[PDB]
Structures are given as C-alpha cells and as structure tokens.
Amino acid sequence: TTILPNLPTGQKVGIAFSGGLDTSAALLWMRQKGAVPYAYTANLGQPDEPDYDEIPRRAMQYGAEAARLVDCRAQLVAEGIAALQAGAFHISTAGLTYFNTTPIGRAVTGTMLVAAMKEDGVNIWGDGSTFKGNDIERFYRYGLLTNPDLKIYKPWLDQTFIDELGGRAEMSEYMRQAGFDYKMSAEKAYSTDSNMLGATHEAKDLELLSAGIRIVQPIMGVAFWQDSVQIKAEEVTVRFEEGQPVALNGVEYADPVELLLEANRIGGRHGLGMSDQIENRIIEAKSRGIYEAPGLALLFIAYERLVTGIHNEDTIEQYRENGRKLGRLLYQGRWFDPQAIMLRETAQRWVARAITGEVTLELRRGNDYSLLNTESANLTYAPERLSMEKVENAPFTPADRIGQLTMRNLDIVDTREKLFTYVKTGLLAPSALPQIKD
Amino acid sequence: TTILPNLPTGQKVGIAFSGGLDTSAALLWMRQKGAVPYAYTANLGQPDEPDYDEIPRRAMQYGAEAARLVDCRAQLVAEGIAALQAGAFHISTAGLTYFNTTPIGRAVTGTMLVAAMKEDGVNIWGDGSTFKGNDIERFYRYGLLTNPDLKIYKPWLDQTFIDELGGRAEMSEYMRQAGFDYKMSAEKAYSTDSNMLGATHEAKDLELLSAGIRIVQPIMGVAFWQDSVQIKAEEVTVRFEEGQPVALNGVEYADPVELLLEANRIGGRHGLGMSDQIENRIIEAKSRGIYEAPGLALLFIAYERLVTGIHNEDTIEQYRENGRKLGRLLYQGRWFDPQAIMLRETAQRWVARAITGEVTLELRRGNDYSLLNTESANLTYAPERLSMEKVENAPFTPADRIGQLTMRNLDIVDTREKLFTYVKTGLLAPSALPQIKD
Numbered sequence: 001t002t003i004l005p006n007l008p009t010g011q012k013v014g015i016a017f018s019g020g021l022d023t024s025a026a027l028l029w030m031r032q033k034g035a036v037p038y039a040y041t042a043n044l045g046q047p048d049e050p051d052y053d054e055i056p057r058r059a060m061q062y063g064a065e066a067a068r069l070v071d072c073r074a075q076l077v078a079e080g081i082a083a084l085q086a087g088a089f090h091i092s093t094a095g096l097t098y099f100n101t102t103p104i105g106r107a108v109t110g111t112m113l114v115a116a117m118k119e120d121g122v123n124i125w126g127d128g129s130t131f132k133g134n135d136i137e138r139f140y141r142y143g144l145l146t147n148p149d150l151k152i153y154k155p156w157l158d159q160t161f162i163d164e165l166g167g168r169a170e171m172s173e174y175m176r177q178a179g180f181d182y183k184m185s186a187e188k189a190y191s192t193d194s195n196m197l198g199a200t201h202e203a204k205d206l207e208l209l210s211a212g213i214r215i216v217q218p219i220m221g222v223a224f225w226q227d228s229v230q231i232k233a234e235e236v237t238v239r240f241e242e243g244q245p246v247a248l249n250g251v252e253y254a255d256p257v258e259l260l261l262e263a264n265r266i267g268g269r270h271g272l273g274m275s276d277q278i279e280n281r282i283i284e285a286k287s288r289g290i291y292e293a294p295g296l297a298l299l300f301i302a303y304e305r306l307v308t309g310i311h312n313e314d315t316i317e318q319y320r321e322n323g324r325k326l327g328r329l330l331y332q333g334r335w336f337d338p339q340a341i342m343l344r345e346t347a348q349r350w351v352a353r354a355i356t357g358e359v360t361l362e363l364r365r366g367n368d369y370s371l372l373n374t375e376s377a378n379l380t381y382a383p384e385r386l387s388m389e390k391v392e393n394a395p396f397t398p399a400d401r402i403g404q405l406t407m408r409n410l411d412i413v414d415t416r417e418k419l420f421t422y423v424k425t426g427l428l429a430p431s432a433l434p435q436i437k438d
Numbered sequence: 439t440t441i442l443p444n445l446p447t448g449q450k451v452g453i454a455f456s457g458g459l460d461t462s463a464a465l466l467w468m469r470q471k472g473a474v475p476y477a478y479t480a481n482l483g484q485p486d487e488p489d490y491d492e493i494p495r496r497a498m499q500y501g502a503e504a505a506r507l508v509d510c511r512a513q514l515v516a517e518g519i520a521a522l523q524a525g526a527f528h529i530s531t532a533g534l535t536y537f538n539t540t541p542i543g544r545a546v547t548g549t550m551l552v553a554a555m556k557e558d559g560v561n562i563w564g565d566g567s568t569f570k571g572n573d574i575e576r577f578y579r580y581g582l583l584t585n586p587d588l589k590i591y592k593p594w595l596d597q598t599f600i601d602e603l604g605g606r607a608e609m610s611e612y613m614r615q616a617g618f619d620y621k622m623s624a625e626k627a628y629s630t631d632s633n634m635l636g637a638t639h640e641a642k643d644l645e646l647l648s649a650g651i652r653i654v655q656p657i658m659g660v661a662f663w664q665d666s667v668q669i670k671a672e673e674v675t676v677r678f679e680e681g682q683p684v685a686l687n688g689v690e691y692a693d694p695v696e697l698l699l700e701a702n703r704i705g706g707r708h709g710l711g712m713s714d715q716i717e718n719r720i721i722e723a724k725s726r727g728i729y730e731a732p733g734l735a736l737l738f739i740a741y742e743r744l745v746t747g748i749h750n751e752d753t754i755e756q757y758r759e760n761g762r763k764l765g766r767l768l769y770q771g772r773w774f775d776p777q778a779i780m781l782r783e784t785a786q787r788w789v790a791r792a793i794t795g796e797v798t799l800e801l802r803r804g805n806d807y808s809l810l811n812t813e814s815a816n817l818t819y820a821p822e823r824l825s826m827e828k829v830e831n832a833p834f835t836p837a838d839r840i841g842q843l844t845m846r847n848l849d850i851v852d853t854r855e856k857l858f859t860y861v862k863t864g865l866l867a868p869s870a871l872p873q874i875k876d
C-alpha cells in the first residue's frame with residue numbers, strides 16, 4: 001500500500017507547505033491529531049508570492065516539527081530551458097501554445113521536496129492533490145521515483161479529515177479555535193497555480209466556455225484585451241549561445257534565473273504568450289485553462305526563429321514530432337522516464353547546441369509582435385549562395401534542375417496509375433483528376 | 439524528353455497567361471518565332487486582380503491562337519478547406535503558421551490549366567517557372583499527372599529567348615517594336631504571388647533578414663505594425679457543420695467561395711494571420727517569405743478550437759502528426775499522390791465530420807485576438823460530468839483514483855532502476871535524481 005487512507009499517528013509526515021488555508025489547517029490538524037508534520041516550502045519564484053521567508057515561520061507557529069524553504073529556482077529554470085530546447089509542448093490551439101509550466105513545476109517540486117524529506121528521515125508525504133486532477137498522479141510518480149520507500153497520505157481519504165476540515169469555512173474556524181486568525185485571500189472567479197515559468201487559471205467561472213480571458217486578472221503581465229490599457233511598443237533582442245539564453249537587450253546574464261526574471265518583465269508589459277486551451281487530462285477527460293508565460297513565450301519565439309534559419313527540414317520535422325511526444329510525457333508526469341530522456345537529450349544536443357545567434361522583435365499587445373532581425377554565424381539561410389548573377393559561382397545550372405525533374409517521371413507514372421486503380425476499386429470518382437468521394 | 443529546350447516551332451504551346459510582362463512578351467515572341475501559342479488564364483480570385491476578363495482579350499491582341507479564362511475559384515476554396523480540415527501546414531515559427539497557399543494554388547492551376555490545354559489538343563506547356571524555385575517542380579508533377587503526354591517548354595533553356603528577352607527592359611522594348619505600349623506595374627522592394635487563399639511576399643529586399651514585414655504593403659489586409667493605423671476591435675462568429683465552414687456572424691453561405699471572400703474581409707481589417715518564415719525549399723536550400731492569409735487564419739482558429747473541444751488526445755495527436763506530414767507533401771507538389779490522399783482523407787472523414795459548432799472571437803491587431811465563446815452539440819468538454827458535488831452522479835470516487843495510481847508502481851520501479859543503470863553506464867551523473875551530463 002502506497003496510499004495511506006488514515007492519518008499516520010505517531011509518524012513523521014512531510015507537507016508540501018504553500019502556506020494557504022488548505023496546508024495551514026492540515027498541518028495544525030496533523031499536529032493536534034498525533035502525527036509529526038514537517039513543512040517543506042518550495043521557492044519557485046512565484047510571481048504572486050511576496051515573502052517566502054514568512055512561510056516556514058508560520059509553519060512553526062502551526063506546530064511543524066521543523067520547517068524548511070527549499071530553493072527550487074535554478075532547477076525550475078534549467079528544466080524550463082530544457083523543455084524550450086526540445087519544444088516539449090503538446091497543448092496548442094491554432095499554434096498558440098501552452099508551455100507546460102505546471103508539469104515542469106511538478107517535476108521539480110516532486111523530486112526536490114521528496115528528496116528534502118528523505119534527508120530528514122521523512123518517508124510519508126501528506127499530499128492533498130485532488131482525486132480528479134493531473135497533479136495527484138505527477139506527484140505520485142515523481143515521489144516514488146525519488147524515494148522508493150515513500151508512502152503518501154491522502155487526507156481526503158480520511159473521514160476524520162473530511163468531517164472536521166470538510167471545507168474552507170470549517171478550516172478557517174478550526175484555525176480560529178486554535179488561536180490563529182487566518183486571513184483569507186480575496187475570492188476570485190477562478191483558481192490559479194503559478195511559478196516563475198508561468199501561471200495557470202482554471203475552474204469556477206472558467207469552467208464555462210462562454211467565459212474566458214475577459215474575466216482574468218493576469219499576474220505575470222497586463223490585461224492587453226482591455227482597449228483602455230496603454231501598452232507602449234518595445235524592441236527586444238534575445239541572444240542564445242549553444243541553445244542557452246544568455247543575453248537580453250545586449251546585457252549578458254551569468255545567472256539564467258535573472259535572465260528569465262527579466263524576460264518575464266519584458267513579455268509581461270505586453271501580455272505576450274497568453275492563451276486559452278481546452279486540453280485532455282491524464283484521466284481522459286477535458287479541462288479548460290487560461291495561461292500566462294511571458295518570458296518563456298519571448299524565448300520560444302527567438303529559439304524557434306533561429307531553428308528555422310539553422311536546421312534542415314528533416315531535423316526540424318524530428319524536433320517538432322519529438323517535441324509533441326515529449327510534451328505529452330511531461331504532462332503525464334513522465335519527464336524523467338527513459339522514453340522522455342531519449343527525446344529531451346536528442347534536442348538538447350543536436351538541435352540546441354547549434355542555436356547561437358540573436359533575434360530582434362517588436363512587441364505590441366498580446367501575441368501581436370513583429371520580427372525585425374535574425375542573426376547567426378550558424379545560419380544555413382544564405383541567399384547569396386543561390387545567387388545566379390555570376391554563373392562562375394552559381395551552385396547549379398538550369399540544365400542541372402532539368403535533370404533533377406526528369407528523375408521524377410517513373411514515380412509520377414506510378415501515381416497516375418494508382419489514381420486509375422482507385423477509380424476502378426470505387427475509392428475515387430471518375431474524371432481534371434479523379435475526386436475524393438464525399 | 440519531357441522538357442523541350444527549344445521553341446516548338448509549328449506546334450501548339452499552352453501558356454499559363456497571367457498577363458504580366460513575362461507572359462505577355464513570351465506569348466508575342468512565341469507567335470513571332472513560329473509556334474502556335476494558346477493562352478489560359480486561371481481565375482483564382484486574386485486580391486490584386488481587378489479585371490480577369492481583360493486578360494484573355496490582351497492575349498488575343500498579342501497573337502494567341504485562342505485565349506480562355508478558366509474559373510478555378512471553387513476548386514481553390516475546396517482544396518483550401520481540405521488543407522484546413524487536415525491541418526496540412528508544416529511551415530511555422532513559434533506556432534505562427536504559413537497556410538501553404540501557394541502550394542494549394544499550384545495544385546489547382548497545374549491540374550486545371552493542363553486539363554484545359556488537353557481538351558484543346560494542346561500537349562505542350564511553355565512554363566517559365568525558374569530553375570531555382572519550388573513551382574517548376576510542382577507544375578511539372580501536376581502537369582504530367584494530368585496529361586501523361588505533356589511536354590514542357592522552358593524558354594530559359596532557349597538561348598534565342600535569353601538573347602532577345604533576357605530581361606524586363608528587353609521585354610518591354612520587344613513589345614514596343616511590335617506596337618504594344620506595355621504599362622509596367624510600379625516597382626516594389628519584393629515579389630508577390632497571390633490567390634484568394636493568401637499572398638506571399640519574397641525576394642529582393644526581403645532576402646535580407648534585417649528587413650521584414652515593416653517594408654511590406656499588404657494586399658489582403660491592413661498594416662497593423664504601423665501604430666498610426668487605426669484598427670477597431672470586432673467580434674466574429676464562425677460556424678462549421680461537419681467540418682465545412684457554413685456561416686459567419688449568423689449569415690449562412692451556400693457558396694463557400696462567398697464565405698471565404700467574407701472571411702478574408704473580416705480577417706483583413708485586422709491583418710490576422712500574417713507571418714514571417716524562413717523555410718526549406720524542395721531543393722534543400724532556404725528561402726524567406728512574408729505571408730498573408732486572413733480568411734484561412736480566421737477559419738483555422740475556429741476549426742482548431744472546436745477540434746480541442748471535441749476530439750480525444752490520440753485523435754488530436756494523429757491529426758497534428760499527419761498534418762505536418764501532409765503539409766510537406768503538399769509543398770513538394772505531391773498533394774494528389776497516394777501517401778497524401780491517405781493523410782487528407784483520414785482527417786476529412788474522422789476528424790472533420792465531427793466538427794459542428796460555433797466559435798466567437800474578438801479580433802484586434804495582427805495575431806492578437808481573444809476567444810469569447812465555443813459552442814457545439816459534439817463537445818466532449820463537459821465539466822458537469824466531472825462534478826462530484828452529488829456522489830450519486832460522480833463518475834469515479836477517490837478510492838477509484840487510488841486504485842489507478844497503484845497500477846503505476848511496477849513501471850515506476852523499472853524506471854528508477856533504469857536511472858541507476860544509466861549512471862553505471864556513464865550516461866547520467868550520480869545524485870534529487872541523476873542528471874543529464876552537459
């Protein structure tokens with residue numbers, strides 16, 4: 001049994017402690033009911049978190065045996081850049097892409113918080129991830145990959161938990177009786193999960209497809225869909241060296257975390273990268289989200305532009321196929337499985353290491369931008385090599401191309417004969433050419 | 439020999455007669471040198487063509503034996519809608535897609551103009567497509583597929599042609615000496631090819647990656663990248679029935695050609711769909727284009743949104759994989775080959791026939807838009823089916839999900855063991871988890 005349905009009284013239980021009402025009440029309750037809760041807070045560079053240092057302090061106030069802030073920023077940005085290099089994004093609508101920011105965050109917090117628990121002798125995680133979402137499965141897999149002895153306590157399996165803390169009103173009351181005046185956040189018409197890479201908005205009013213971005217207050221950028229909001233055009237240059245983003249606007253960043261924070265600032269002024277997606281959850285049911293990822297979106301445009309100037313068609317085709325495959329694995333919580341490693345490493349090496357260069361863009365509102373310049377010592381784009389002005393340098397002659405065309409004849413005849421066979425066998429209608437039957 | 443290097447004196451030669459200087463001078467020359475030229479003009483609903491009826495009249499003035507206007511509008515829109523249904527677009531940059539509008543146009547004009555030639559006993563096409571582009575190969579394949587006896591005259595293989603009409607100045611002079619005052623179009627800093635589906639801008643100043651959309655005067659929409667240009671927000675509803683676009687803004691269109699003309703008007707007011715691409719040509723060298731396709735872009739957003747609300751993950755994955763594969767075939771001139779038919783029909787049937795519904799959008803500038811509503815009797819998106827409020831209707835219980843998670847354990851252990859094997863064999867660095875070595 002991996003999933004414990006009852007409070008592990010007398011045992012150490014690790015809590016991924018965000019400091020919200022759910023984890024605050026749960027930690028107090030676990031302590032009051034006889035377990036030994038340990039709090040672990042991940043520093044994920046959340047755009048909406050103004051004071052990570054205060055969270056472990058509150059955990060101790062609520063009865064944590066010990067409370068740690070685990071810095072996950074560098075790992076989050078490293079995994080995000082790997083996802084970018086491998087195009088590991090499978091959710092899109094007319095090309096507008098979701099950058100799998102929650103999946104990446106979960107890969108980083110599942111592994112790193114469970115590792116922190118393991119170094120404290122904590123082999124039980126009290127994980128509140130719901131029975132209907134994706135995160136319960138992601139955390140389950142990342143946790144067991146990291147600690148094979150891990151057990152997971154699901155408080156919603158525990159009737160004692162549902163009976164006392166069955167809701168927000170009950171939780172807040174529970175805290176009050178213990179002498180803590182929990183100050184709830186202002187109610188919103190949706191639910192938000194965020195990290196430095198991006199933010200996701202879902203549930204509540206966003207469950208209705210008649211609602212959309214118009215009801216969202218963005219937390220990583222501005223409300224560009226409000227015509228009253230003023231957004232100044234801005235030019236930005238993004239430089240890559242061997243696939244790693246290294247400079248913005250001519251300023252070099254030794255720290256990729258600082259680079260992403262600046263990329264977020266730049267994209268954020270425009271609302272660059274926001275999208276609305278209906279996606280398929282792991283359990284084969286659909287959900288709807290509104291997404292923000294301004295910095296990754298900026299880096300994605302630049303990276304993709306350089307890929308299109310540097311790589312051949314087969315290479316781009318494999319990159320894109322692999323990316324869609326990898327995105328789905330990432331979403332499923334399989335980012336560290338062998339089949340994911342294969343796809344990720346392929347891109348990190350043969351695709352990304354050739355990506356050295358700069359792209360200059362003008363950002364306006366939302367996903368309206370213009371490309372201004374593309375530079376790279378590695379471009380294979382080189383119109384002068386196709387120049388025919390001077391035959392002394394021309395790469396091929398008219399006669400050469402004629403030869404190339406002639407080689408196509410036998411297979412053309414074969415295709416023509418197929419069309420006649422397809423008419424004879426009833427698949428195509430008789431005829432310029434036979435037509436597909438509708 | 440398919441390609442004739444010398445003027446077929448005494449023989450009937452079909453010209454795809456656009457009425458520009460190249461085809462005008464070529465037709466006059468062919469007549470003066472002893473061939474029997476026939477002119478065929480395709481009505482492709484070009485956004486920049488104000489009078490198709492005048493073109494065959496000029497052909498007759500220049501010496502055509504006969505001149506026909508072949509209406510290709512309905513076929514162009516039908517093939518465009520098929521491409522949309524099958525997502526047959528392989529050129530993209532950060533999701534911004536080129537809709538393969540030139541490839542589709544060539545599939546329609548290659549077949550239909552060669553068929554028109556064949557019904558007039560014309561088995562020779564005087565085709566000026568250059569030795570360095572994609573179109574020479576597309577027309578070659580579509581032509582031989584349509585007429586197995588076709589031969590193609592390449593005037594640039596004919597030194598007599600290069601010597602007299604070796605350039606625009608020489609061509610215009612040639613026309614003058616024959617008593618025709620050819621009125622040249624105003625010079626542009628790039629070359630444009632267009633049809634009702636889209637327009638492409640390339641060459642000349644657009645060969646430089648430091649230039650871009652900022653130098654283009656769009657012909658299907660407005661210059662949204664000019665902050666001085668005023669663009670009013672607009673709401674639009676797009677309805678599909680069984681994958682066919684049937685209504686815009688509550689108005690039903692029996693004629694798909696009329697629907698696309700209206701979709702172009704709507705998208706055009708915003709510049710919706712414009713992109714900048716570096717792509718790989720058939721000959722494995724890169725070229726750069728600026729593209730317009732406002733109506734298709736509008737239909738693509740709506741179609742894709744409905745696909746994401748209706749189809750399961752495996753179905754969407756196959757649709758997208760197939761689409762990228764098909765886009766490349768389309769670009770290569772293989773739209774009618776068996777491997778293309780397979781991909782196209784799959785989507786036209788099992789993907790597109792379930793696409794009945796409406797999508798409402800707000801269009802602003804360029805590719806900045808918002809989704810406002812998505813409706814369909816065929817949605818599988820249905821949050822109420824996931825509702826747990828009433829366990830009497832809940833689709834699964836917390837206990838059910840726990841069972842599902844438990845089934846993952848054996849393969850998780852296998853993955854963990856792989857990571858240790860990968861460390862032992864030197865692929866991963868020792869360790870939360872072992873790391874990829876850079």
Ligand SMILES: Nc1ncnc2c1ncn2[C@@H]1O[C@H](COP(=O)(O)O)[C@@H](O)[C@H]1O
Binds near residue numbers: 016042109127
């Ligand atoms: N910054 C964080 N540090 C530690 N745990 C977190 C953090 N953010 C989220 N979690 C855990 O992940 C769960 C789901 O997060 P959310 O979707 O943001 O509610 C929370 O209930 C926590 O247990």
Ligand SMILES: Nc1ncnc2c1ncn2[C@@H]1O[C@H](COP(=O)(O)O)[C@@H](O)[C@H]1O
Binds near residue numbers: 478479481482567630
């Ligand atoms: N509307 C049209 N009707 C007939 N032939 C055309 C038409 N447009 C283009 N073509 C043919 O295709 C060639 C290449 O077109 P373009 O790329 O627009 O110069 C022209 O030189 C013509 O021979």
Ligand SMILES: [Cl-]
Binds near residue numbers: 044104109194195
């Ligand atoms: Cl996260």
Ligand SMILES: [Cl-]
Binds near residue numbers: 130132133134
């Ligand atoms: Cl959920």
Ligand SMILES: [Cl-]
Binds near residue numbers: 281
């Ligand atoms: Cl999935």
Ligand SMILES: [Cl-]
Binds near residue numbers: 357358376378
């Ligand atoms: Cl460089």
Ligand SMILES: [Cl-]
Binds near residue numbers: 542543547632633
């Ligand atoms: Cl065309």
Ligand SMILES: [Cl-]
Binds near residue numbers: 568570571572
């Ligand atoms: Cl060319």
Ligand SMILES: [Cl-]
Binds near residue numbers: 313718720770
């Ligand atoms: Cl290609």
Ligand SMILES: [Cl-]
Binds near residue numbers: 794795796813815816
């Ligand atoms: Cl419907």
